[PDB]
Design a protein around this ligand. Sequence first.
Ligand SMILES: O=c1ccn([C@H]2C[C@H](O)[C@@H](COP(=O)(O)NP(=O)(O)OP(=O)(O)O)O2)c(=O)[nH]1
Ligand SMILES: [Ca+2]
Ligand SMILES: [Ca+2]
Ligand SMILES: [Ca+2]
Ligand SMILES: [Ca+2]
Ligand SMILES: [Ca+2]
Ligand SMILES: [Ca+2]
Ligand SMILES: [Ca+2]
Length: 903
Amino acid sequence: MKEFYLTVEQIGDSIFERYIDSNGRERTREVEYKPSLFAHCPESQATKYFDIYGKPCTRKLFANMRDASQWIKRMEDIGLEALGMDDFKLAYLSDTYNYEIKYDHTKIRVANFDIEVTSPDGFPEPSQAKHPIDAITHYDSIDDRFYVFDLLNSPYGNVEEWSIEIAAKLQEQGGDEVPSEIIDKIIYMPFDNEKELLMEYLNFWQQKTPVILTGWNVESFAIPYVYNRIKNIFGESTAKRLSPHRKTRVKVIENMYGSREIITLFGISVLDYIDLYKKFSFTNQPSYSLDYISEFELNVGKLKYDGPISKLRESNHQRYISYNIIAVYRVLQIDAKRQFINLSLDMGYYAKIQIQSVFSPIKTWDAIIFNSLKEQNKVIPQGRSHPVQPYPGAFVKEPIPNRYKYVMSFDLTSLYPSIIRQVNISPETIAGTFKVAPLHDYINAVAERPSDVYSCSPNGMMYYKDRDGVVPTEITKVFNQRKEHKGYMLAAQRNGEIIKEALHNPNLSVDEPLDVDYRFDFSDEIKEKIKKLSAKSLNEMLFRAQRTEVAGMTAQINRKALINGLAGALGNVWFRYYDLRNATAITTFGQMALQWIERKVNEYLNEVCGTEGEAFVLYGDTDSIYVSADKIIDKVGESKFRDTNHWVDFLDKFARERMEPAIDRGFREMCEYMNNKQHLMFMDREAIAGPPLGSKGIGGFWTGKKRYALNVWDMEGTRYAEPKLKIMGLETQKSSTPKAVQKALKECIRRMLQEGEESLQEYFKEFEKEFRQLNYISIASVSSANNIAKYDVGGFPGPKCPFHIRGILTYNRAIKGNIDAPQVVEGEKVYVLPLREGNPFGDKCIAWPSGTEITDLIKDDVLHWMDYTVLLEKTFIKPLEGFTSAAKLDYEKKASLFDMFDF
DNA sequence: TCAAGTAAGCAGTCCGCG
DNA sequence: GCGGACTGCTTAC
Ligand SMILES: O=c1ccn([C@H]2C[C@H](O)[C@@H](COP(=O)(O)NP(=O)(O)OP(=O)(O)O)O2)c(=O)[nH]1
Ligand SMILES: [Ca+2]
Ligand SMILES: [Ca+2]
Ligand SMILES: [Ca+2]
Ligand SMILES: [Ca+2]
Ligand SMILES: [Ca+2]
Ligand SMILES: [Ca+2]
Ligand SMILES: [Ca+2]
């Protein structure tokens, strides 16, 4: 096999690399890597190295990395550019792996671990590590085993060994229900004392040294705690054995309102799953506890136990260990679904960076672009300092708040990356500037043509057309990968809908799910077999189709995130290729394109309808337009359609055969007007929306910018078995909105869009009557809580104190003096409830850590004083009033003359 | 919330608005 | 009581 790196580090003048050799063996080596950097040289001096602008450079080979770093300093002292890759390990990787890396995940040791620490005096601070580690479960991907290290004797209690037989039993048998499929994969090791436990763990670590280290909150808790605990018991040298190169560093992570410490283990790539999840999942959760996320992702019930966690080991050590093992498995289950580790490896090896650098788009793109240029013997420029400056972004049309019955939307393919490609926007393709007219003049095609020679953006920038810039070139490669995976995602999505349809008529029989690749549209043969399958088999296929779709979603959406991140990076001062001229060339072209096509679509449709100045485009945001199709439907006549699907087909055909060609013509003209290098503005139909044929549903409504709801029948070629609500921006979509309220508001919207005003009124009246029965957690608001200290005037709300912060201060007084009560963590999220006047908490609201039950110390009192009236009005009635006034409907039946008596 | 970008919504505080 | 200036938080893209 071809070799590939596992990890790389710079330690002084040595590169330390762990890698898989040509025989598939893990190896380590120390290399005295001599780096090269570059300086501009005279035209005379013959060279093969040129900077991205075509100016000649001399290569400087240094005796060692320290010399190179020092030279960079002196070059700054002199005031001259020091060119080349200043991150020496990236240059090392580029030299050592000068080919497209193909990696084998089966050779990469991926470790997933979790520890337990009993603490009777509150949260056990990793930086202190004053409490024994009493459990470690460590899963190894190469062995496919869970290694369980269990402390039987501690100052906080001596316990009996964990029993695998009881662990396997159902909760109803008194067991812990450790999943049967991992029972045989557990290697259990009890220990007489903590020193023994930790010494054995370190020996185990040495034999099975993680390459990728993951788990839940491992970077902020598990790793620093293990490191600091071993340091406290044995000393520094022993704790550094967690690093294969025996090198560690405390890293201070700074944010706006403080800082925290983590331990960097040289020679290990830490990918904390909570951070992977936050970056790659595209969710915003009310809580990020493993329990909450597992339930959300996997639909597994929370891990139940009696009493506080600080008494769990002593009271039920059996459950204690089982839950430690289950916690490790949950992360594995989430990754089996989401595949973020696979994604991270793909991206890391593609860019040739330390795997953990995938968290940084800037680092990722710096490496991709460096490797690309190096292949042509080109030399990258030095990074410079820039002051942070605001710059303009996308255009969003102000909609007329209203109901909108029939709607067709259209969307540009991967807009920002397409603009970069079309215009040829790159650091080295800048050709000059032209005199800009007001954006309106370009939108209306009355401005003078910018250039007869170069490719232009309406921000005034011109670009070369003779060759592609490196940014367009590299962005295209990733865009093409993204396209492939999106293809698989949509096929799986369409396949899912085929199965749902079949599920309307499941056969009475015993059979098996078909063995198929869900990434490709089902053939006619497969469809026929599906129509004969049992519900059991069909549901299994649906689950599998949906898992395939999730895998495709992960692969496609995060590759899109990467290329969009490059457009954004051009506007970040730490990016080597930072340039507001290029960042704004993109955004400004975007504004023109959206409004240009709005005009063209309006023009086209007015022509087809034979009307004048009518506004068909009702809304647009960045790269999408929403078109009223009422007149198109009315041209045929609603009474002439057989069913809902009939007009959906009709609108689909009209969009594809009439509107898209017109849109294409419009954008080709714009391309020529801007003299762009390549036409890549591809705007296809996205959604077809409307009420069910013959219903009183309103189809859709807008309340304002970034706030709307549509009843969609077809999305990007997926014809739904059942209509799907597309709701953007509304309270149903916000993590701050109480869970039960999201649900209720969503049902109100469904009724508005699908059934009509009377159905809406029926549901509202019922929710209003019954909501007081809802679990307090389901009706609590949620909010991140920052700057708590700023607003704490020992210990009451200071001036301008935010509502949720006030709740926290209320909570803090109510639990003061209590060492064991759960503390609100700065920067985390809290549940928030309003309190009725005269309550014993002495304030109008209380807040506690999200994803948790409020402590029994005050639960009863909170429940008794909860202000249901305020809650309802603020979280439900206000938003609903917004929806209904926009849609021009009433959520409460207004009086009429008919109310004048039945008999 | 360490880690690419801007636009823009709504809750809430403070306080004017005769 | 509503709206502006402002902070805080959260989405859409
Ligand atoms: O996180 C984002 C999302 C979007 N954008 C910009 C770039 C993107 O091209 C544009 C439109 O975003 P979409 O959600 O429409 N996705 P995009 O058009 O990039 O690809 P596609 O529409 O094909 O999914 O908005 C960002 O800069 N950052
Ligand atoms: Ca735990
Ligand atoms: Ca790849
Ligand atoms: Ca798009
Ligand atoms: Ca998309
Ligand atoms: Ca059937
Ligand atoms: Ca869009
Ligand atoms: Ca207001």
